[PDB]
Design a protein around this motif. Sequence first.
Motif, PDB file in Angstrom:
ATOM      1  N   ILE A 156       1.146  -1.259   0.307  1.00  0.00           N
ATOM      2  CA  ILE A 156       0.224   0.292  -0.704  1.00  0.00           C
ATOM      3  C   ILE A 156       0.888   1.397  -0.457  1.00  0.00           C
ATOM      4  O   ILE A 156       0.468   2.024  -0.745  1.00  0.00           O
ATOM      5  CB  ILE A 156      -1.087  -0.424   0.959  1.00  0.00           C
ATOM      6  N   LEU A 157       1.832   1.250   1.126  1.00  0.00           N
ATOM      7  CA  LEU A 157       2.704   2.465   0.753  1.00  0.00           C
ATOM      8  C   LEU A 157       3.562   2.393   0.457  1.00  0.00           C
ATOM      9  O   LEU A 157       4.989   3.603  -0.517  1.00  0.00           O
ATOM     10  CB  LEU A 157       3.662   2.474   2.393  1.00  0.00           C
ATOM     11  N   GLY A 158       4.780   1.565  -0.852  1.00  0.00           N
ATOM     12  CA  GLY A 158       5.189   1.609  -1.309  1.00  0.00           C
ATOM     13  C   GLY A 158       6.444   1.665  -0.822  1.00  0.00           C
ATOM     14  O   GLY A 158       6.973   2.524  -1.067  1.00  0.00           O
ATOM     15  N   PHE A 159       7.586   0.969  -0.519  1.00  0.00           N
ATOM     16  CA  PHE A 159       8.330   0.523   0.163  1.00  0.00           C
ATOM     17  C   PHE A 159       9.377  -0.818   0.626  1.00  0.00           C
ATOM     18  O   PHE A 159       8.131  -1.784   0.884  1.00  0.00           O
ATOM     19  CB  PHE A 159       7.851   1.413   1.663  1.00  0.00           C
ATOM     20  N   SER A 160      10.247  -0.584  -0.224  1.00  0.00           N
ATOM     21  CA  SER A 160      11.236  -1.818   0.595  1.00  0.00           C
ATOM     22  C   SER A 160      11.290  -2.144   2.408  1.00  0.00           C
ATOM     23  O   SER A 160      11.779  -1.478   2.761  1.00  0.00           O
ATOM     24  CB  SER A 160      12.694  -2.159  -0.470  1.00  0.00           C
ATOM     25  N   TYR A 161      11.592  -3.341   1.950  1.00  0.00           N
ATOM     26  CA  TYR A 161      11.930  -3.461   3.974  1.00  0.00           C
ATOM     27  C   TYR A 161      12.984  -4.840   4.379  1.00  0.00           C
ATOM     28  O   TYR A 161      12.963  -5.633   3.151  1.00  0.00           O
ATOM     29  CB  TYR A 161      11.027  -3.497   4.944  1.00  0.00           C
ATOM     30  N   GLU A 162      13.622  -4.986   5.847  1.00  0.00           N
ATOM     31  CA  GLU A 162      14.640  -5.923   5.601  1.00  0.00           C
ATOM     32  C   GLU A 162      13.670  -6.469   7.176  1.00  0.00           C
ATOM     33  O   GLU A 162      13.867  -5.856   7.801  1.00  0.00           O
ATOM     34  CB  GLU A 162      15.444  -5.504   5.721  1.00  0.00           C
ATOM     35  N   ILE A 163      13.747  -7.959   7.079  1.00  0.00           N
ATOM     36  CA  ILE A 163      13.351  -8.049   8.638  1.00  0.00           C
ATOM     37  C   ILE A 163      15.037  -8.556   9.390  1.00  0.00           C
ATOM     38  O   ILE A 163      14.914  -9.486   8.638  1.00  0.00           O
ATOM     39  CB  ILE A 163      12.298  -9.257   8.324  1.00  0.00           C
ATOM     40  N   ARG A 164      14.437  -7.980  10.743  1.00  0.00           N
ATOM     41  CA  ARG A 164      15.792  -8.804  11.861  1.00  0.00           C
ATOM     42  C   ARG A 164      14.890  -9.284  12.975  1.00  0.00           C
ATOM     43  O   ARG A 164      13.660  -7.822  13.783  1.00  0.00           O
ATOM     44  CB  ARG A 164      16.953  -8.066  11.984  1.00  0.00           C
ATOM     45  N   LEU A 165      14.825  -9.782  13.288  1.00  0.00           N
ATOM     46  CA  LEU A 165      14.641 -10.683  14.349  1.00  0.00           C
ATOM     47  C   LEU A 165      15.824  -9.969  15.602  1.00  0.00           C
ATOM     48  O   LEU A 165      16.736  -9.929  15.658  1.00  0.00           O
ATOM     49  CB  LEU A 165      14.782 -12.638  14.600  1.00  0.00           C
ATOM     50  N   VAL A 166      15.019  -9.259  16.878  1.00  0.00           N
ATOM     51  CA  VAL A 166      15.257  -8.569  17.868  1.00  0.00           C
ATOM     52  C   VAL A 166      16.387  -9.036  18.678  1.00  0.00           C
ATOM     53  O   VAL A 166      16.383 -10.719  18.842  1.00  0.00           O
ATOM     54  CB  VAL A 166      14.134  -8.079  18.573  1.00  0.00           C
ATOM     55  N   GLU A 167      18.140  -9.075  19.128  1.00  0.00           N
ATOM     56  CA  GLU A 167      18.220 -10.089  19.811  1.00  0.00           C
ATOM     57  C   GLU A 167      18.046 -10.733  20.754  1.00  0.00           C
ATOM     58  O   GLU A 167      18.839 -11.245  21.267  1.00  0.00           O
ATOM     59  CB  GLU A 167      20.159  -9.110  19.431  1.00  0.00           C
ATOM     60  N   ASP A 168      18.176  -9.891  21.970  1.00  0.00           N
ATOM     61  CA  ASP A 168      17.450  -9.500  23.338  1.00  0.00           C
ATOM     62  C   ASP A 168      15.850 -10.620  23.598  1.00  0.00           C
ATOM     63  O   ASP A 168      15.800 -11.599  24.304  1.00  0.00           O
ATOM     64  CB  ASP A 168      17.388  -8.671  24.465  1.00  0.00           C
ATOM     65  N   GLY A 169      15.503 -10.833  21.517  1.00  0.00           N
ATOM     66  CA  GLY A 169      14.335 -11.746  21.882  1.00  0.00           C
ATOM     67  C   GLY A 169      12.915 -11.874  22.747  1.00  0.00           C
ATOM     68  O   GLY A 169      11.886 -12.339  23.500  1.00  0.00           O
ATOM     69  N   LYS A 170      12.383  -9.437  23.147  1.00  0.00           N
ATOM     70  CA  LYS A 170      11.698  -9.781  23.945  1.00  0.00           C
ATOM     71  C   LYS A 170      10.966  -8.545  23.297  1.00  0.00           C
ATOM     72  O   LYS A 170      11.777  -7.300  21.942  1.00  0.00           O
ATOM     73  CB  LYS A 170      12.954  -8.683  25.161  1.00  0.00           C
ATOM     74  N   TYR A 171      10.363  -8.211  24.056  1.00  0.00           N
ATOM     75  CA  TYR A 171       9.041  -7.098  23.097  1.00  0.00           C
ATOM     76  C   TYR A 171       9.154  -5.525  23.665  1.00  0.00           C
ATOM     77  O   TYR A 171       9.269  -4.974  23.151  1.00  0.00           O
ATOM     78  CB  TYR A 171       7.790  -7.626  23.884  1.00  0.00           C
ATOM     79  N   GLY A 172       8.966  -5.342  24.567  1.00  0.00           N
ATOM     80  CA  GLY A 172      10.013  -3.746  25.344  1.00  0.00           C
ATOM     81  C   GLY A 172       9.552  -3.638  26.966  1.00  0.00           C
ATOM     82  O   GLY A 172       7.892  -3.415  26.937  1.00  0.00           O
ATOM     83  N   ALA A 173      10.359  -3.678  28.510  1.00  0.00           N
ATOM     84  CA  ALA A 173       9.903  -3.759  29.237  1.00  0.00           C
ATOM     85  C   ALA A 173      10.882  -2.596  29.866  1.00  0.00           C
ATOM     86  O   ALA A 173      11.715  -2.334  29.313  1.00  0.00           O
ATOM     87  CB  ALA A 173       9.723  -4.740  29.900  1.00  0.00           C
ATOM     88  N   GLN A 174      10.789  -1.622  30.637  1.00  0.00           N
ATOM     89  CA  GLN A 174      11.210  -0.406  31.489  1.00  0.00           C
ATOM     90  C   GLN A 174      12.053  -0.957  32.909  1.00  0.00           C
ATOM     91  O   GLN A 174      11.488  -1.575  33.364  1.00  0.00           O
ATOM     92  CB  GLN A 174      10.778   0.559  31.012  1.00  0.00           C
ATOM     93  N   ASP A 175      13.016  -0.440  32.859  1.00  0.00           N
ATOM     94  CA  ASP A 175      13.381  -1.472  34.455  1.00  0.00           C
ATOM     95  C   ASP A 175      13.086  -0.414  35.479  1.00  0.00           C
ATOM     96  O   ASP A 175      12.780   0.478  34.809  1.00  0.00           O
ATOM     97  CB  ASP A 175      14.874  -1.994  34.508  1.00  0.00           C
ATOM     98  N   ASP A 176      14.063   0.055  36.249  1.00  0.00           N
ATOM     99  CA  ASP A 176      14.068   0.539  37.190  1.00  0.00           C
ATOM    100  C   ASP A 176      13.630   2.360  37.626  1.00  0.00           C
ATOM    101  O   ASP A 176      13.827   3.020  37.759  1.00  0.00           O
ATOM    102  CB  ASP A 176      13.890   0.440  38.858  1.00  0.00           C
ATOM    103  N   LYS A 177      15.298   2.110  36.556  1.00  0.00           N
ATOM    104  CA  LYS A 177      16.108   3.080  36.209  1.00  0.00           C
ATOM    105  C   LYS A 177      15.149   3.881  34.801  1.00  0.00           C
ATOM    106  O   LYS A 177      15.567   5.326  34.222  1.00  0.00           O
ATOM    107  CB  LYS A 177      17.348   3.599  35.778  1.00  0.00           C
ATOM    108  N   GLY A 178      14.107   3.565  34.578  1.00  0.00           N
ATOM    109  CA  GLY A 178      13.394   3.813  33.544  1.00  0.00           C
ATOM    110  C   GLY A 178      14.114   3.186  31.803  1.00  0.00           C
ATOM    111  O   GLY A 178      12.840   3.616  30.763  1.00  0.00           O
ATOM    112  N   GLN A 179      14.611   2.524  31.687  1.00  0.00           N
ATOM    113  CA  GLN A 179      15.524   2.301  30.245  1.00  0.00           C
ATOM    114  C   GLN A 179      15.157   1.319  29.908  1.00  0.00           C
ATOM    115  O   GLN A 179      14.408   0.198  30.503  1.00  0.00           O
ATOM    116  CB  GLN A 179      16.769   1.602  30.636  1.00  0.00           C
TER     117      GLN A 179
END
Lengths: 253, 252
Positions: A43-66
């Motif tokens: 639909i948008l007309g773009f090419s892409y490259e798929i890369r599995l994220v290395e740490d294998g996680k979706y996304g959480a923040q630690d106590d320091k906000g990272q």
Amino acid sequence: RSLIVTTLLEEPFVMFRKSDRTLYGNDRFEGYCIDLLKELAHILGFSYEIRLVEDGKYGAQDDKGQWNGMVKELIDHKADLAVAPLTITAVREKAIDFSKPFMTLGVSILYRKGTPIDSADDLAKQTKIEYGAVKDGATMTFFKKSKISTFEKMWAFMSSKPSALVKNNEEGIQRTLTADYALLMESTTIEYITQRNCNLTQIGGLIDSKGYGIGTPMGSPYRDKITIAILQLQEEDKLHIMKEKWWRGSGCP
Amino acid sequence: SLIVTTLLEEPFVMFRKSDRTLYGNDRFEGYCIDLLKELAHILGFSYEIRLVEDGKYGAQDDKGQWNGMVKELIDHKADLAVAPLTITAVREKAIDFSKPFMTLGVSILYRKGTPIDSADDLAKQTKIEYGAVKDGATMTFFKKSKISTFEKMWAFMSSKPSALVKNNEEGIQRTLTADYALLMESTTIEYITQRNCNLTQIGGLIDSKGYGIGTPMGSPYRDKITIAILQLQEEDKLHIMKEKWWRGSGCP
Ligand SMILES: O=S1(=O)NCN(C2CC2)c2ccc(F)cc21
Ligand SMILES: O=S1(=O)NCN(C2CC2)c2ccc(F)cc21
Ligand SMILES: C=C(C)[C@H]1CN[C@H](C(=O)O)[C@H]1CC(=O)O
Ligand SMILES: C=C(C)[C@H]1CN[C@H](C(=O)O)[C@H]1CC(=O)O
Ligand SMILES: [Cl-]
Ligand SMILES: [Cl-]
Ligand SMILES: [Cl-]
Ligand SMILES: [Zn+2]
Ligand SMILES: [Zn+2]
Ligand SMILES: [Zn+2]
Ligand SMILES: [Zn+2]
């Protein structure tokens, strides 16, 4: 310039294609999110490259906000899109730019059949049956920050016993089959297993109302383009067709 | 202060019944009014509620110009659009929608005991008429749809001008007075079917959409309202808020 797409292996969203030839590049992957990604690129007309994220996680923040996982890749401009069952949450939306949801879901319970348990309230009032969720996921964070008295009592249980939280869905599915254990899992994945493993079932209804969204770095111009494309895909009944394409198993009587 | 455009629509925005004459924002009550007060306090802004003049949600004309609340946002005559404004692709190309605060889908409002079971049943037959609110989100869906069933249903509604109603209030009467099925959003069906026990929802949901808060494109309030709506959902405040306004005598 091609877009960098970070993602994760999760049935039936992103899976490894099986073949007699060795596969390279994006040809290695198949699934709901892969079909959705090819449709957005169409639909948008773009090419892409798929890369599995290395740490294998979706996304959480630690106590320091990272952050970690796919959300960190978008924050660090290490990826252009995050095409996965990435749950839309307020904390994640404050860090990245979610597109509008392409799939609706809610938190529910995966458990065995033949049990008088009718709701999450029944799990909280008892102790013999252990329950939990995927660690640092969206479901666990929901119980951690919730103020509802029933869910507050349930979070005290999960946080006290470190084994109650599983590393991922596969371990949680395995634990519900080998022990007296109920998994707090998102409804879309529950619907997938309850159609293929007739031993498990859904307990109660949906406790909340959320959605999966495509993740982009904050300020990305592709967010609104993907939102409009997802809306066009829904109105053309195509998100409906490709979901029924990957979710329809043999069924359970 | 921010200018908030809206519409009279049960039970989202209604005139608060009183014996004395009400002025300003006190004139209004409803789900969207409660949502606006919650959003205003979280984001810390004052507002003025103004009913849009033409009394419309937002459709395009032959020249491509918008009307209703959408045009109000495009011309920067309003900062927010707090109403049951359905999120559609064509509208998203014109304004900045927040994330949805309520889910809904197109369904069928019709009499009880009737044999019709789905929209596909309506398309195959002709004796029972069907339609939707004119120039609404539902009617625009059927007009642009390429699905063969919906292409046939749009030919029926457009052929007989009486199939399209002016608003929901007239459409509910046409299901209550004629052999007519109304293509209506599920949230409004859920509201009336608990007040009028002669009506029911025929079939399931035809699509999967949502109501969003409208802002002019590029507004800095879009993401602020989006995050606030997400926090409202995670804190179970949207569940309490809908149950408060989705009342009724109840129907067995
Ligand atoms: O995360 S959202 O964008 N905002 C929260 N909701 C609202 C409960 C309707 C929903 C409901 C269904 C979705 F797919 C997404 C969302
Ligand atoms: O207008 S949206 O932001 N995108 C379309 N969808 C998709 C069917 C999941 C949904 C589903 C439920 C909503 F509340 C909003 C939307
Ligand atoms: C498969 C996993 C671990 C993901 C999928 N969506 C959630 C997320 O985006 O955090 C997780 C499930 C959950 O937390 O119940
Ligand atoms: C009450 C009305 C005419 C509105 C409400 N949401 C839709 C919209 O935002 O256009 C309309 C309903 C519909 O089109 O079935
Ligand atoms: Cl958005
Ligand atoms: Cl006015
Ligand atoms: Cl809702
Ligand atoms: Zn379909
Ligand atoms: Zn289908
Ligand atoms: Zn301006
Ligand atoms: Zn509640």
